[PDB]
Design an enzyme around this catalytic site. Sequence first.
Site, mmCIF file in Angstrom:
data_model
loop_
_atom_site.group_PDB
_atom_site.id
_atom_site.type_symbol
_atom_site.label_atom_id
_atom_site.label_comp_id
_atom_site.label_asym_id
_atom_site.label_seq_id
_atom_site.Cartn_x
_atom_site.Cartn_y
_atom_site.Cartn_z
ATOM 1 N N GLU A 35 0.815 -1.216 0.000
ATOM 2 C CA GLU A 35 0.000 0.000 0.000
ATOM 3 C C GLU A 35 0.855 1.276 0.000
ATOM 4 O OE1 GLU A 35 -3.103 0.439 -0.548
ATOM 5 O OE2 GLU A 35 -4.013 -1.532 -0.288
ATOM 6 N N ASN A 46 -7.688 9.297 -5.594
ATOM 7 C CA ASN A 46 -8.510 8.392 -6.407
ATOM 8 C C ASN A 46 -9.339 9.131 -7.459
ATOM 9 O OD1 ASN A 46 -7.644 6.143 -4.770
ATOM 10 N ND2 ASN A 46 -9.057 6.893 -3.205
ATOM 11 N N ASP A 48 -12.453 9.279 -8.039
ATOM 12 C CA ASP A 48 -13.683 9.871 -7.545
ATOM 13 C C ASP A 48 -13.448 11.126 -6.692
ATOM 14 O OD1 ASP A 48 -12.616 8.726 -5.271
ATOM 15 O OD2 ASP A 48 -14.517 7.901 -4.565
ATOM 16 N N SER A 50 -11.639 11.243 -3.878
ATOM 17 C CA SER A 50 -11.244 10.886 -2.529
ATOM 18 C C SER A 50 -9.729 10.679 -2.532
ATOM 19 C CB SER A 50 -11.965 9.612 -2.065
ATOM 20 O OG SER A 50 -11.661 8.510 -2.910
ATOM 21 N N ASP A 52 -6.383 8.523 -0.409
ATOM 22 C CA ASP A 52 -5.896 7.496 0.528
ATOM 23 C C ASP A 52 -4.694 8.003 1.325
ATOM 24 O OD1 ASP A 52 -7.757 5.879 -0.729
ATOM 25 O OD2 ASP A 52 -6.280 4.806 -1.922
ATOM 26 N N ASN A 59 -8.991 5.430 3.101
ATOM 27 C CA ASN A 59 -9.726 6.250 2.127
ATOM 28 C C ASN A 59 -10.621 7.306 2.779
ATOM 29 O OD1 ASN A 59 -11.301 7.212 -0.074
ATOM 30 N ND2 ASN A 59 -11.070 5.262 -1.130
#
EC number: 3.2.1.17
Length: 129
Positions: A35, A46, A48, A50, A52, A59
């Site tokens: 990750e 991301n 959309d 959002s 991380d 998220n």
Amino acid sequence: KVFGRCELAAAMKRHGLDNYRGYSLGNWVCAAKFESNFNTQATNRNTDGSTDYGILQINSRWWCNDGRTPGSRNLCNIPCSALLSSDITASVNCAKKIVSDGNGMNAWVAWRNRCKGTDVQAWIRGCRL
Ligand SMILES: [Cl-]
Ligand code: NA
């Protein structure tokens, strides 16, 4: 902070992740490696809108507040920046909530694609725990 493999394993064990909801320590270390490359300061945006955050790439769509993800929830009740600390307490406490929500570690795409069904004990091999 960029953790060493065994340093992180020991930190996670201390914070109660070992066998948490049936996931051995190796799973958590493997997930963190793929990750964030063990970097607490990792961020990724991301499609959309959002973002991380941190060692486990939590998220902002569901789990933390970053003030810039409209219509999102803050299920861990924390600012996302708290997930970037060299102290992993906040990330771990939030991960415990995520892994308990019904889908287990499948919530983490890199765990599903790169750790799940592999020899995850290899990730803590040699470590003093
Ligand atoms: Cl599970
Ligand atoms: Na949010």
